[PDB]
Design a protein around this ligand. Sequence first.
Ligand SMILES: c1ccc([As+](c2ccccc2)(c2ccccc2)c2ccccc2)cc1
Ligand SMILES: c1ccc([As+](c2ccccc2)(c2ccccc2)c2ccccc2)cc1
Ligand SMILES: [Cl-]
Ligand SMILES: [Cl-]
Lengths: 144, 144
Amino acid sequence: SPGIWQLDCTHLEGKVILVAVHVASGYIEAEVIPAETGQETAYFLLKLAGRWPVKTVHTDNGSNFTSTTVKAACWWAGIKQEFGQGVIESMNKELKKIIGQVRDQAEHLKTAVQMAVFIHNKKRKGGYSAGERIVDIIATDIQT
Amino acid sequence: SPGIWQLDCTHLEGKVILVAVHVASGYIEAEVIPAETGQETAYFLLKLAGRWPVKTVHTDNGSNFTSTTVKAACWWAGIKQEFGQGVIESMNKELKKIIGQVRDQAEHLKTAVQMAVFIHNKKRKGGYSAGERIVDIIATDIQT
Ligand SMILES: c1ccc([As+](c2ccccc2)(c2ccccc2)c2ccccc2)cc1
Ligand SMILES: c1ccc([As+](c2ccccc2)(c2ccccc2)c2ccccc2)cc1
Ligand SMILES: [Cl-]
Ligand SMILES: [Cl-]
């Protein structure tokens, strides 16, 4: 299902990392956020939905989606919560693994996170990359 | 040329808006940044290059790309500066136009910017939208 995304937060170095995964492809979008709050979640959701066709979002922490600010962002962008596993578990530990490997390539964690996203999305696995798969899935979906 | 992006900053309400446009499609990515600095430009460049295949970036303010931090981000991500107009002028005023129209739909400007990106990218112009065009262009490019 091409419009389904998974969104969670993880923690590293006293900071919070919001990680979104496009389920059908394994492509990730991530941001280091200053605090685990509804405001940050809502702003990220609105940003993502303007960049990719987001129809439903799943999470492993349902409480992350209860705040008025998150519900208003889902309302405006027309997102609904996905009510129904292997891919997502493998992308987050793999993201932390890649972060660990490039941590010394930047001063700040936020920089290393985006180096990790870049490596993850371009890594051919075979054997296309997640980046190649999301664009194929969406482009195929557009054309009927 | 599918890997070319244009990046500039604009100003509204005492704030700075970084606007990136994928030249061949008119798709936009934008962020309200706290300051017009090399650090913010570099972080945005690294983020963008992990999400789309960025080969060259053009700007209407060449000085925006001279800081060690921006050059290091371009080095790491393998981006080069594009050395060689209608589309970009039409997207920024159009973004400010859409922002003006939704400004009262959110408290903060940063929220309205991302509502404006969302509307812009989904607007069918015919007659596909910029979002549809970038995915078609990239997916076509991948497959030879
Ligand atoms: C490999 C080696 C060095 C960096 As550099 C850097 C800065 C502090 C500690 C360790 C590495 C870097 C550039 C941009 C953003 C984050 C880190 C770096 C290396 C050479 C010239 C400029 C910057 C990246 C990859
Ligand atoms: C993010 C930014 C704005 C809203 As609204 C609102 C509009 C004007 C000033 C302040 C907030 C909102 C409406 C209803 C319930 C919750 C939030 C909003 C109102 C009307 C149209 C679009 C958005 C929601 C989420
Ligand atoms: Cl850094
Ligand atoms: Cl707001």
